[PDB]
Structures are given as C-alpha cells and as structure tokens.
Design a protein around this ligand. Structure first.
Ligand SMILES: C[S@@+](CC[C@H](N)C(=O)[O-])C[C@H]1O[C@@H](n2cnc3c(N)ncnc32)[C@H](O)[C@@H]1O
Length: 246
DNA sequence: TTTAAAGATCG
DNA sequence: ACGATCTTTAA
C-alpha cells in the first residue's frame, strides 16, 4: 500500500481495499478531492485528473512533478535535527506566509506539514498558515514517497478548483471518485453535500461512473439514494460507499 | 462610543 | 473538540 508523502485528513488507508473493489474501470480517473492522493497512489489508471480547493496543495504537487530532483534536494535540508524546535519552526512558518516564490513555499509546506501539530493544515481569514509547532521526536522525510509521487504524476493533471468544475472534466472514458469532507455526526456545508450527489446523478446520466465515500448517517443515505450503496464496518459510525453505475 | 452575541485567533 | 483574547456584527 503506497503511502502519501503528506500527513493529511482522509487518508483512508484502511478502506482503500473497499474503494478499489467498488471503483469501476476506465481510462481516466477524476478526483475532485484529491487531498493526499492515497487513491491516486494506489490505483492504476492511464490518466488522472486530480483536483482540490487548496492552492498550496496543488502548487506543491505541480512543483514536485516538474522539478522533482531540485525540490527533494532543497526540502531535505529542512529535515535535520537543528530545525526540530519551536523558534525555528515559527520563523519558517513566517517565511512561508511571506514568501512569493512557489518553489520556496512548496519546500516549506512539506516541513510545516511534518513538523506541525497533528499534521494539520489550518489558515486564518488572512490566508496565513497558523498551525503551532508539533514537537515530534524525529519527523520523517518522505523521500521515497516523493519520488514515487513524481513518477505517477507524469500521467496526472493537477487543478485548483471546486468539485463542480473538476467533475465537468469527466468524459465517457472517465471514472469519478469523490471523497468530500465528512458529513456531520451531530467549511463544507450541507448544501454542497447534496449538490455533490446531484452532480453525481448528472454524470451517471451521461454514462459516467461515480463513486462517493462518506459516513453512514441518515443524511448520507438520503443524499445517495439513487446509488448502489455498500456499507463497510469500521458512537460507532461506519463508512458508506455510494456507487452510481451507468 | 454602547451593547450583546457571535465569530475568529492560535497555541 | 479546547480556551483565553482578540475582532466582527447589528441595532
Ligand atoms: C477530507 S480530504 C480527503 C482527501 C483525499 N480523499 C485523501 O485521500 O487524502 C477532502 C479534500 O477536499 C478538498 N475540499 C474541501 N472543500 C472542497 C470544495 N468545496 N470543493 C473542492 N474540494 C474541496 C480539501 O482541500 C480536502 O483536502
């Protein structure tokens, strides 16, 4: 199982096996919520259309793809014992928020992701990364995961856009896998959740297979009503895999 | 400026 | 989800 080089929400490693079993075959894979791209790294499609609303994430992916060796060498400098402390961390965080260079920001972004608290990615309304120091014993430098991402990225396009705009890139050769932010058990609104389901029903009308993963609640069961539902056993909340087969 | 509730900040 | 301390919002 290929691991992403980033700490990210919805890694979904345990249920990667369930995704592949319910994900149809096609020429191209479309991911509106690529995130860490665990599905992308653990599937084998000819082409990939990978999208996310996070511009720092998308910019990082483009840098890693086009400038792999240059990036790895520069980023590896950050992962040494001297940079594993609060004072250095907050200066690099400040440098990141003030940097105008995409390459430099991409380098610092990996450092912040690995040395920051819980591997979180949080911004204020000023667009500034404000995750505190994580204080780990020894953050891991994902060199192998980086090179593996770069090689697989050669068959992928990265776009920074909302799900509605990325799913419209899908055609008949396409297969769409959606991994939206989790639905409430008691940002991403409820309207966007239902809208995603409606867009899915639109694609399946044009003979485009769509697979959506989410929590198994009352709202999600209602939203994905027109889909072939599968429940995976993970309060005790299970996950739901909604399949819109043409 | 006042006021109260709400939202935002960031360790 | 936490919490003290900011800013925001509307009459
Ligand atoms: C919970 S993560 C899942 C990522 C991915 N499935 C993985 O394996 O890491 C969902 C991602 O969707 C992106 N996202 C959030 N809201 C979005 C929106 N309204 N439109 C498009 N993408 C969005 C976020 O940047 C986030 O990284």
């Amino acid at each position: 199982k290929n691991r992403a080089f980033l700490k990210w929400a919805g890694g979904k490693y345990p249920l990667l096996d369930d995704i592949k079993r319910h994900l149809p075959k096609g020429e191209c894979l479309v991911e509106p919520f690529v995130g860490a791209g665990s599905v992308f790294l653990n599937t084998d499609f000819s082409r990939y259309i990978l999208a996310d609303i996070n511009s720092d994430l998308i910019s990082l992916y483009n840098i890693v793809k086009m400038r792999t060796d240059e990036y790895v060498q520069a980023a590896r400098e950050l992962f040494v014992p001297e940079t594993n402390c609060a004072e250095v961390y907050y200066q690099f965080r400040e440098e990141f928020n003030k940097s105008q260079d995409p390459f430099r920001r991409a380098v610092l972004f990996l450092y912040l992701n690995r040395y920051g608290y819980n591997g979180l990615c949080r911004y204020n309304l000023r667009g500034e990364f404000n995750v505190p120091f994580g204080r780990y014993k020894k953050p891991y430098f994902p060199e192998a995961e980086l090179y593996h991402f770069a090689e697989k990225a050669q068959n992928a396009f990265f776009y920074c856009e909302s799900y509605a705009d990325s799913m419209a890139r899908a055609d008949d050769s396409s297969v769409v896998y959606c991994d939206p932010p989790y639905a409430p058990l008691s940002s991403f609104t409820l309207e966007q959740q239902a809208h995603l389901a409606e867009i899915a029903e639109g694609l399946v009308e044009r003979h485009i297979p769509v697979l959506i993963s989410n929590h198994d609640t009352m709202l999600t069961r209602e939203w994905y009503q027109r889909a072939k539902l599968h429940v995976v056993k993970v309060k005790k909340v299970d996950e739901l895999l909604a399949l819109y087969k043409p």
